[PDB]
UniProtKB/Swiss-Prot annotation:
Superkingdom classification of source: Eukaryota
Protein name per UniProt: P3(40)
Site (Cleavage): residue numbering on this chain: K1, L2, F4, F5
Effect of substituting A6G: In AD1; Flemish mutation; increases the solubility of processed amyloid-beta peptides and increases the stability of peptide oligomers
First and last residues shown, out of full length: 687 to 692 of 770
Organism taxonomic ancestry: Eukaryota, Metazoa, Chordata, Craniata, Vertebrata
C-alpha cells in the first residue's frame, strides 16, 4: 500500500 522515501 504506502511507500514513502525522501
Amino acid at each position: 500500500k504506502l511507500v514513502f522515501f525522501a
